[PDB]
Amino acid sequence: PLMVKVLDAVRGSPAINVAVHVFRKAADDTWEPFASGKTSESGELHGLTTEEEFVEGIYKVELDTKSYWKALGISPFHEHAEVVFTANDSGPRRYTIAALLSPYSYSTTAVVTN
Amino acid sequence: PLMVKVLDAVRGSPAINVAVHVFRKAADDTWEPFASGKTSESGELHGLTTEEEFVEGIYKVELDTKSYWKALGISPFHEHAEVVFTANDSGPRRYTIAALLSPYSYSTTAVVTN
């Protein structure tokens, strides 16, 4: 139900080997680790969760953008990029969290499909 | 030393009355409230802090984008837009945190000057 795709706006390439951590908000409002991985050679991260596990709730997807830019020898602004959203059952649904990275800027878009 | 500017990509206008909360990471690794405010009719938020108060640290600027869109009748994807960065680690700088908002997407850029 949840995929992450990351692009590099400096090199015009997939952003490879980006660490991605997903958290789910707990009843005590803390962030509990939910799933994680690293983006592939295609800048994508699949298989984070399953339909059974990915119930409604508030999720945070954190991309370690600082480590990514450091590895490329480029001084970045952000510590990380965080994407926070509520998962909503309103029919069958797939979430793609897309991110476009520059050293002092990023954009993120949600592509939500049936 | 810290200003926030927000635009609405649907209307082609400043994003007015966006609530902004700034936090600073404390010694115990928790997020301590640092300053807050709301964007003006120009989409800008000035006067959050001072050169004296704005010491080195890791800061989080949280824009309440969900409330912004809902007040305009739109159910957006994100809970908020969070911008996390180390500030002033090589001396005082002036930071403009810019954000561009769409219902299922946002971008953020930092302009940093000496």
Place this chain on the structure above:
Amino acid sequence: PLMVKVLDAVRGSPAINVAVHVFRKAADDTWEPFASGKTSESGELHGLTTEEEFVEGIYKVELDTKSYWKALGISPFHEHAEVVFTANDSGPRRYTIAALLSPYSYSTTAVVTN
């Protein structure tokens, strides 16, 4: 060698049925029609050209964003979105022209892979 992918930042969806025109710059500096199509249900447009046809030169990819937003009943700013670039033989290469659309804003990124 050339693919186009378009996303809709208002609906968080592929941008479907977007008209795409590709032009190649001629010797007299005019834009000559090269290929065209409409994005699919996945927001993608494949099969525009072939390795044999897609030689080095200056190309323009035009997305009819105005007609797209009009069909959705949304007032847009731009007449269209234009992406202009030189194709460069520097090893085996695939170009993806990606675009993210809002009514008063768009971004475009080139993903260039081997």
Place this chain on the structure above:
Amino acid sequence: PLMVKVLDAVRGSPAINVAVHVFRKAADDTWEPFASGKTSESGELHGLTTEEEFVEGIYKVELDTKSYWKALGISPFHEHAEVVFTANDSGPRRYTIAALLSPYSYSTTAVVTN
């Protein structure tokens, strides 16, 4: 009535000395030169035109991003960034054309005020 503002997403700075050419579509459907200039140290370009001269029409604002990046030692993807729009079709407006530049990506937003 027409201002251009450009930021550099690699440096987190204004994009200084970006050449800007404005064209207006003539009655014979060709692009007639309308105004030009370059961005200041603030990344802004003011004084392109006047309320009297800036009549209804279809305008193209072309930013020479390729020359900008090459002067900084970067071989970018795009030849330029072109922004094409109908202006003043329901009376005089003020237009800010904003652009955010990366070597293989750019975004542009319009802020339109009455």
